[PDB]
């Protein structure tokens with residue numbers, strides 16, 4: 018729920034301590050009190066039902082956008098753009114090849130977002146970041 | 149954790165040691181009750197540095213016992229644990245409740261509830277150990293453990309360790 | 320807990336106050352003295368401290 | 376009839392402590408009589424209020 | 431609320447209600463126990 | 478507010494407010510609540 | 526476009542007025558969303574091309590995207606003479622906060638510059654354009670000659686007057702904070718009644734704002 | 748009438764039906780229906796005994812569900828008794844309910860935190876607890892069992908953490924059960940509450956019977972300086 022945190026079942030009204038502690042691995046409405054209870058002992062699975070990905074407490078952050086899909090798209094864009102940082106001067110002013118590079122990086126960002134070709138694009142990213 | 153500190157200790161010299169060379173009896177008795185001694189305030193005191201010059205104050209005769217109380221001030225290396233610190237060590241004993249890892253002069257007990265669930269006890273194997281799908285924790289095996297709680301009495305220090313956090317366990 | 324009139328509550332708390340007072344000081348001016356089964360006054364802590372037979 | 380209407384949370388009934396005999400019947404204008412589990416109810420009896428000036 | 435209210439008529443508790451939309455308007459007093467009902471004809475009122 | 482005259486009758490204190498005197502027993506819980514509200518600078522001036 | 530809209534929604538959640546240049550907004554958007562100025566300069570064109578190629582029968586659901594494309598294209602191309610204002614309260618009278626984001630054009634000479642550049646001869650004329658030297662400073666254009674005519678009248682065709690005080694010599698003003706004062710409203714009402722009594726055919730009354738007129742007419746009727 | 752009054756009446760009816768027994772519900776519904784009630788009127792309506800209403804009035808006064816007024820009047824026969832008037836202080840009552848539920852959920856969170864602490868140990872002979880910190884200082888030379896300080900008996904393991912999720916389940920099984928309460932207080936916090944008193948409650952009472960011994964007219968006095 019946008020107002021209530023189902024892991025502790027606390028409304029924002031009578032329990033104002035709930036916050037937007039999101040996970041880069043799997044974005045969820047877990048509050049800080051639930052984070053400090055479950056994951057202070059160590060890493061565990063996702064407390065939400067229907068999801069069991071292993072997550073760490075130190076990787077937690079706050080969401081800056083209202084939409085979860087936009088937030089994960091922007092975070093994937095950050096995770097790709099860190100090594101993919103070719104500019105116009107990197108292409109020596111080649112405008113067309115810069116557009117092709119931008120299309121390629123947007124396509125691999127889209128593929129990482131929707132997971133249609135996650136393995137091959139992840140291998141391509143891992144080979145590119147070594148260079 | 150290893151530190152170097154300046155410590156002051158009250159030593160009660162018996163009147164039988166009131167000789168011309170009383171200072172060397174005081175220094176020798178200083179070592180025997182400090183070297184390897186465990187104090188909960190300052191941790192396990194290991195070695196006494198600056199032995200050539202040790203600040204020995206003028207001792208006060210106790211008004212009913214006759215022994216002389218000196219306030220000996222010395223610089224010594226100590227080992228004081230803390231919660232939330234990561235230390236390496238070797239396992240010296242194992243049981244169904246857990247295994248004891250030897251870090252410095254101290255034995256940290258790692259409880260059974262504070263390990264990954266893949267580890268389970270096996271008393272049939274000699275020596276008894278904990279076996280997992282990726283590693284084993286046996287006697288005289290290197291393991292990195294995070295101390296999450298230490299209890300310090302007046303003369304003993306016991307610490308509780310965990311290996312549930314990532315980048316811990318065997319090295 | 321079980322409900323009582325305010326006179327009964329005040330009476331019970333006055334009894335508790337008197338018992339605590341005579342436990343700490345049995346010789347109070349203008350007050351009844353707590354007595355034993357034999358009729359002798361209860362030796363309070365103040366009686367145990369004062370006098371030539373006290374702790375001091 | 377009163378026993379069946381009591382458990383349906385339609386009426387409020389006054390019964391003796393010695394036996395469950397209906398004597399006086401009211402109307403249950405509120406919610407269900409068994410909405411809260413018993414184990415929470417005693418927890419509601421574990422808290423109190425300081426005074427009339429703080430709150 | 432302005433047209434309805436508790437009252438004591440002839441040492442008997444009851445409710446006074448206004449029947450204004452009907453012509454002539456009426457003041458109906460009804461006892462809480464339902465013992466009697468008293469109404470007022472509002473046309474022939476002087477003081 | 479007008480502070481009542483306080484006098485002792487045994488193990489309890491009774492206060493009589495000034496008539497424009499109405500006498501009532503001051504409960505020990507009321508005195509405890511009022512003593513809880515005394516500021517640190519206040520009872521330090523009183524020697525506490 | 527979706528992440529641009531979400532960044533705008535993030536920026537609207539503010540508790541105080543933020544006045545920022547378009548360059549600062551672009552830098553913050555790049556550092557928070559990785560959106561550059563150059564894709565923003567083509568936002569409206571790309572949106573129009575996408576809507577054309579989609580061949581959508583309904584465009585009413587996409588009317589709000591036109592405002593986003595307009596904001597994206599305006600704030601990217603223009604960075605000098607423009608200012609972005611974010612206010613937590615659109616109207617201070619409302620209890621619930623209603624945020625509003627205003628991208629306004631501070632330099633009025635920007636829009637009229639291509640008019641003077643394209644056309645050599647421009648004849649600015651109004652019935653009551655005064656002073657004539659304010660406009661060539663306000664809008665960047667040079668006048669070859671500026672002059673104001675005075676009508677030659679056999680008799681004084683119109684009679685202006687300035688009324689500084691009421692009938693009871695109380696000074697009158699239409700300041701917004703003193704609209705609820707009795708005496709100024711008494712003077713205005715008596716003035717309007719007397720002028721209606723002495724005017725033959727018709728009469729028009731002008732007010733500084735719509736809210737001022739609403740208040741004064743409602744309490745005049747009161 | 749006033750919708751906010753209906754909301755606070757339903758809130759007061761809900762909290763007594765859940766955490767209190769049937770007689771408490773009868774008393775609070777009597778006060779909510781007839782806004783001004785005395786002891787004799789409450790006994791006449793409920794057919795309740797003086798000793799029966801004792802614990803009920805004590806519990807609703809301890810939670811500030813019922814406020815009491817100590818006004819005495821002058822009947823014509825001059826045989827006046829100091830009748831107590833039971834009424835409700837609506838802002839005080841809703842503040843008390845809010846404070847009680849906030850303390851209950853805080854206590855439940857604290858109990859969840861205490862159960863999240865490791866199991867520890869307990870000695871079945873001397874019935875004493877021992878934490879996991881002090882268990883290690885009591886282990887034997889064989890490094891196999893933890894021995895008691897007094898009994899010198901092997902400690903058995905407690906269940907601090909095995910039922911912890913159950914407490915969370917209890918937490919869940921509270922929250923939906925407290926869901927109509929929190930939803931009611933949303934409209935309460937978003938609206939204005941008029942602070943009622945004995946004089947205000949006399950504007951909305953319902954007459955319990957025709958011949959009432961308790962007089963509802965307030966009698967002011969001169970000289971009282973409380």
Ligand SMILES: [Zn+2]
Pocket residue numbers: 022023024025026027035047048049050051052
């Ligand atoms: Zn939570």
Ligand SMILES: [Zn+2]
Pocket residue numbers: 043044045063064065068069070
């Ligand atoms: Zn998940």
Ligand SMILES: [Zn+2]
Pocket residue numbers: 870871872873874875895896897898899900
């Ligand atoms: Zn024992």
